[PDB]
Amino acid sequence: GFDPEKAQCCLVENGQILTHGSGGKGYGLASTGVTSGCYQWKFYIVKENRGNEGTCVGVSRWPVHDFNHRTTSDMWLYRAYSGNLYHNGEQTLTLSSFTQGDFITCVLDMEARTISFGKNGEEPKLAFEDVDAAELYPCVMFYSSNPGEKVKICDMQMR
């Protein structure tokens, strides 16, 4: 689930859900980090503003010093509204957009140093290479100003 000690301007709802709260832009990381091998999981978009989304999903270092999706090198992010990818800036590769009711499969391969994302059970597509953190946590970030978005973290066989 989500760790309330690794959440900023977000609330952890019954462990499994991260809700965008007061205080402006924010983030939350999962409880457990990944340090070797490969780990697969899903995010499920519980609540969003369809066509004007404010969520990114991905993985993060801890501690977080920069959570601005446009600049951060602490996070590797995938943006709901446009399908854009962010790490040390917006990348060329664009994947599918996503919204409320969608699942995003995330594959964090610490051996190959890659991150891949699949939408609604489609095979994951390679998103990032040369991933260069020792330990990474599943994360969600919200760049909207107002509260309300909700994302659930799920096991890889949830559908």
Curated annotation (Swiss-Prot):
Domain B30.2/SPRY: 2-159
Annotated function: Involved in membrane trafficking via some guanine nucleotide exchange factor (GEF) activity and its ability to bind clathrin. Acts as a GEF for Arf and Rab, by exchanging bound GDP for free GTP. Binds phosphatidylinositol 4,5-bisphosphate, which is required for GEF activity. May also act as a E3 ubiquitin-protein ligase which accepts ubiquitin from an E2 ubiquitin-conjugating enzyme in the form of a thioester and then directly transfers the ubiquitin to targeted substrates.
Assembly, per entry: Interacts with TSC2; interaction is inhibited by TSC1. Interacts with PKM, ARF1 and ARF6. Forms a ternary complex with clathrin heavy chain (CLTC) and HSPA1A.
Tissue: Widely expressed.
Protein name (Swiss-Prot/TrEMBL): Probable E3 ubiquitin-protein ligase HERC1
Protein's cellular compartments: Membrane; Cytoplasm, Cytosol; Golgi apparatus
Disease: Macrocephaly, dysmorphic facies, and psychomotor retardation: An autosomal recessive syndrome characterized by large head and somatic overgrowth, intellectual disability, and facial dysmorphism. Seizures, hypotonia and ataxic gait are observed in some patients.
Organism: Homo sapiens
Residue span relative to the full protein: 2035 to 2192 of 4861
